[PDB]
Structure 1
Amino acid sequence: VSQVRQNYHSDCEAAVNRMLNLELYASYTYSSMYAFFDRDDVALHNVAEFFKEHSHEEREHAEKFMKYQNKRGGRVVLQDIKKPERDEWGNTLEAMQAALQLEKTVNQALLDLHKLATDKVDPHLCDFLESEYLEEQVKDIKRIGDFITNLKRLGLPENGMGEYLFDKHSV
């Protein structure tokens, strides 16, 4: 094994690789949402840029897991980044709903990884997840939920004026 490796279970190393892939998958889904809202027949540029920013955030999350893997003496193993579930995202409300579910999926994987780290008695990995991922995840989920509440209030999906107003005053 690696000269630096200490208290790092094989199961955790593997789960970190899977988590890295999931972050990349989330990044790619957000990239797709960006492209959709940038379409001339959708044209909600502030919404598009919100999703573009989130795409970059998730890529940063993945890169941080790569650095982590090496810090612990694990080995980064990459798999295909699957294309997003949809090619088009309907409207701001549908996209935000998809984003909420994606964020809860990523959150569940983080929590599962934390449970594994706990079971394997790895406090460094626990600390890493708590300090670098779990709170940002809760914050993002709350932001998206807040947005969804406001989009519903604004009459989405039917109310195009409401959709315009959201893009101009919320993002």
Structure 2
Amino acid sequence: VSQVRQNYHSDCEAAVNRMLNLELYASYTYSSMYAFFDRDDVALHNVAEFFKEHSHEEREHAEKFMKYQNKRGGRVVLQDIKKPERDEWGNTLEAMQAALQLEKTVNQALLDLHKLATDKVDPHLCDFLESEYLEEQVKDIKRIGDFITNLKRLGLPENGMGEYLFDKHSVKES
């Protein structure tokens, strides 16, 4: 084994690799949403830039797992990054609903990894997840939920003026 390895279970090492892949998958889905809202026949540029920023965040999340793996003496093993589930995202409401589900999927994987780390008595991995992932996850889920509530209030999907107003007032001006 690696000269640095201590209290790091093979199962946790493998699960970290799977989590890395999921972060990259999430990044790619957000990239797709960016490209969709940038289309000339969609043209909601603040929404597009919101998703582009989140795509970058998720890739940073992935890189943090790579660094973590090496710090513990595990070995990064990469797999294909699967393309997103859709090629087009409907409108801001449909995209935000998909984002909420994606964030909850990522959250569940993080919680499952915490359970595994707990089972294998790995407090360093528990701390890493709690300090770097779990709270930012709850914050993102809350933000997207708040957005969905406002999109519904604004009459999405039917109310185009509502969708226009959301892009101008609810997401940061880019």
| Deviation of the 1:128 alpha carbon | 0.1
Residue 99 of structure 1, CA deviation: 0.1
Structure 2 CA distance for aligned equivalents of residues 8 and 111 of structure 1: 18
> CA offsets, 1:71-117, max 9 Å, x none?
00000000000000000000000000000000000000000000000
Write out aligned runs for 1:49-68 (5 A): 49-68=49-68
3-state SS in 1 of match to 2:4 = coil
The size of the alignment, in residue pairs, is 171
Cα deviation digits, residues 33-70 of structure 1 (max 9, x gap): 00000000000000000000000000000000000000
Cα distance, 1:11 vs structure 2: 0.1
**2:19 pairs with 1:13:** no
Q: For the residues of structure 2 that align with 1:165 and 1:94, how far apart are their CA atoms?
A: 16
- TM superposition shift of 1:15: 0.1
CA distance in 2, matches of 1:38, 1:132: 31
Using the TM superposition, give the Cα deviation of residue 137 of structure 1 relative to its aligned residue in structure 2, in angstroms: 0.2
Unaligned runs of 5+ in 1: none
TM-score for the superposition, normalised by structure 2: 0.98
Distance 1:58 1:169 in 2: 24
Residue 85 of structure 2 is matched in structure 1 by 85
Separation in structure 2 between the aligned mates of residue 132 and residue 49 of structure 1, nearest angstrom:
24
Point out 4+ residue stretches in structure 1 off by more than 2 angstroms.
none
Is there any run of 5+ residues in structure 2 with no aligned partner, and where?
Answer: none
Deviations 1:106-160 (A, max 9, x none): 0000000000000000000000000000000000000000000000000000000
The alignment's TM-score, normalised by the length of structure 1, stands at 1.00
Residue 26 of structure 2 corresponds to 26
Name the % identity.
100
- The CA RMSD over aligned residues, in Å, is 0.1
Measured in 2, the distance between the counterparts of 1:40 and 1:124 equals: 48
User: How many Å apart are 1:167 and its aligned residue?
Assistant: 0.1
1:143 aligns with 2:143: yes
Task: Give the Cα–Cα distance (whole angstroms) in 2 for the partners of residues 18 and 53 of structure 1.
Answer: 23
